[PDB]
Design a protein around this nucleic acid. Structure first.
Ligand SMILES: [Mg+2]
Lengths: 105, 197, 45, 77, 109
RNA sequence: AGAGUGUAGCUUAAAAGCACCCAACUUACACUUAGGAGAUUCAAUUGACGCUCUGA
């Protein structure tokens, strides 16, 4: 009740420095298997390090054999944190994979 | 107080060759293969023979060009399966220690400029390096008059390391030779921020 | 650590046999690729 | 069809891979924490010894937007 | 241009406040939405009205809200709630007064 | 040389709970189901084996 000390006990809706922008990591790989595995690993690293990941979609395949494409969206980095993130990405690239740090549009 | 301004860079050459698979990983390779055939969904002999002979005629480049040298520490291709770090001997007026390539910086030059200068100051080459951020990777202070050394980080994209037989003592260390070459605690802890992997 | 996720597989259900064919694009860099009908060696002219 | 012995071997394979990649992730996280804390203590020392350089230490290089770097291979050029 | 809006008040709300003796079947509170949630010995009608399932004293309390796992909207709200957060709702209980019955000597066989 | 000292990553937990990982469902994450390893440094509250800091 409004006048009682327990007023607002049940309210819940309120419960629901240089930084990068939107970062797109593009993974075009000869192998659907390797692309998917790299996407899983990078997503696991992101959610372990508390990185806001928005989308993990894929581009349509292009024929000219085929190369499978994946995308990882990232937002929110720190000075040291970005450095560690991309150096780990560089050091943990399994085999013949194409990274990217491009942005939206 | 009088302070000796000094920076330095722990250059990183990434492994051009991926690490070989362990026997454990090969057993998992066999398991994944057999499950793949189990879970798959549906003159060939002449084609198979032609393709296997096409494979046999061409010899694959050796993944390890290291077993043959055993002494080419100065060579950029000392190791391939693991990352490499530059390490050049230096001789001071009062000290003689195998020290990571250092350089002197001034308040008029920022740390990124100091690192860019050091990229070629001691190598006198056309190496191409890339920086990730102004954030350093290691700090070590040793006094005799204060002093400090900031080990920054950068990665080699490509390198035209001309005149490899330089008068210096540039050695590439992956993980193990770090302790052998750098005894004092202020220099043997570089592995903490060097990617051991 | 360039092998932690190299030992991974397709997680779908409809597909054919895939094999580790070595591929070279233009300069002599052989790479395993999951390719049908084992060639064991590929080169783009 | 399959057999009891190979099923047991597969189970032990899963066990040993669990242990192996557990150690892998543990060492990866150890390196993460070690070099992260090294970087933060380096930034703290930079702030202490240079009040005008930490301001530009946090700035980010604008050349990383078209980042490019290829992965490992087997037969180098 | 503005038509309607002539509906009268529903006369809804609490019919039995705390400390009121309530007999079985009595309506405790009528509500349009779930203002007061049913507590012990309090049943809900089709129209969300709370009625006493036992004869006793009405008590209003604040209790943690744990919706049924099949209540998809509430489960989604919980899934979006930050860790450490606990929802609370006002519950109406009927503390039974009389016992279920007594054992009486009926025949001295 | 001196100080803080001390349960697997965290615990004013006393051999536990959170953590954590792969397998399947997911493009992917998440959820869920199946599994996985884990510690009270050593001797009698005390001393000495390992880590951090203060110096050379
Ligand atoms: Mg009205």
């Amino acid at each position: 009740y409004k006048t009682k000390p327990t007023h607002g006990i049940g309210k819940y809706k309120h419960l629901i420095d240089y930084e990068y922008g939107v970062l797109n990591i593009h993974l075009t790989a000869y192998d659907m298997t390797l692309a998917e595995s790299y996407a899983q690993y990078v997503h696991n690293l992101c959610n372990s390090l508390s990185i806001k990941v928005e989308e993990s979609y894929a581009m349509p395949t292009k024929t000219i054999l085929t190369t499978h494409e994946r995308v990882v969206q990232i937002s929110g980095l720190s000075a040291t944190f970005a450095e560690i993130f991309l150096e780990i990405i560089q050091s943990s690239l399994p085999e013949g994979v194409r990274l990217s740090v491009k942005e939206h549009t | 107080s009088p302070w000796r301004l000094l920076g330095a860079l722990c250059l990183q050459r990434p492994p051009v060759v991926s690490k070989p698979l362990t026997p454990l990983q090969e057993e998992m390779a066999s398991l994944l293969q057999q499950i793949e055939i189990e879970r798959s969904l549906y003159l060939a002999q002449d084609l198979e023979d032609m393709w296997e002979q096409k494979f046999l005629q061409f010899k694959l480049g050796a993944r390890i060009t290291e077993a043959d040298e055993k002494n080419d520490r100065t060579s950029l291709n000392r190791k391939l399966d693991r990352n490499l770090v530059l390490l050049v001997r230096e001789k001071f007026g009062d000290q003689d220690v195998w020290i990571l390539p250092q350089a002197e910086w001034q308040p008029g030059e920022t740390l990124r400029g100091t690192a860019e200068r050091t990229l070629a100051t001691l190598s006198e080459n056309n190496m191409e390096a890339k920086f990730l951020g102004n954030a350093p990777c290691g700090h070590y202070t040793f006094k005799f008059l204060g002093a400090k050394v900031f080990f920054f980080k950068a990665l080699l994209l490509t390198g035209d390391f001309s005149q490899a037989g330089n008068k210096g003592h540039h050695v590439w260390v992956t993980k193990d030779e770090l302790g052998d070459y750098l005894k004092p605690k202020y220099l043997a802890q570089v592995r903490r921020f060097v990617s051991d992997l | 650590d360039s092998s932690r996720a190299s030992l991974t597989r397709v997680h779908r259900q409809a597909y054919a046999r895939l094999y580790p064919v070595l591929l070279v694009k233009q300069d002599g860099s052989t790479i395993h690729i999951r390719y049908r009908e084992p060639r064991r060696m590929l080169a783009m002219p | 069809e399959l057999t009891f012995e190979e099923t047991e071997r597969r189970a032990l394979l899963l066990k040993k891979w669990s242990l192996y990649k557990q150690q892998e992730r543990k060492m990866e996280r150890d390196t993460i924490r070690a070099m992260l804390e090294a970087q933060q203590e380096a930034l703290e020392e930079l702030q202490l010894e240079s009040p005008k350089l930490h301001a530009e230490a946090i700035k980010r290089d604008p050349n990383l937007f078209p980042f490019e770097k290829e992965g490992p291979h087997y037969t180098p050029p | 241009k503005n038509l309607g809006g002539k509906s009268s008040g529903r006369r809804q709300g609490i019919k039995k406040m705390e400390g009121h003796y309530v007999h079985a079947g009595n309506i405790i509170a009528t509500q349009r939405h779930f203002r007061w949630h049913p507590g012990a010995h309090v049943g809900v009608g089709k129209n969300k009205c709370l009625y006493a399932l036992e004869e006793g004293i009405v008590r209003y309390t604040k209790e943690v809200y744990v919706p049924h796992p099949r209540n998809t909207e509430a489960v989604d709200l919980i899934t979006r709630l930050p860790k450490g957060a606990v929802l609370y709702k006002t519950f109406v209980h009927v503390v039974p007064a009389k016992p279920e019955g007594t054992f009486k000597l009926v025949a001295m066989l």
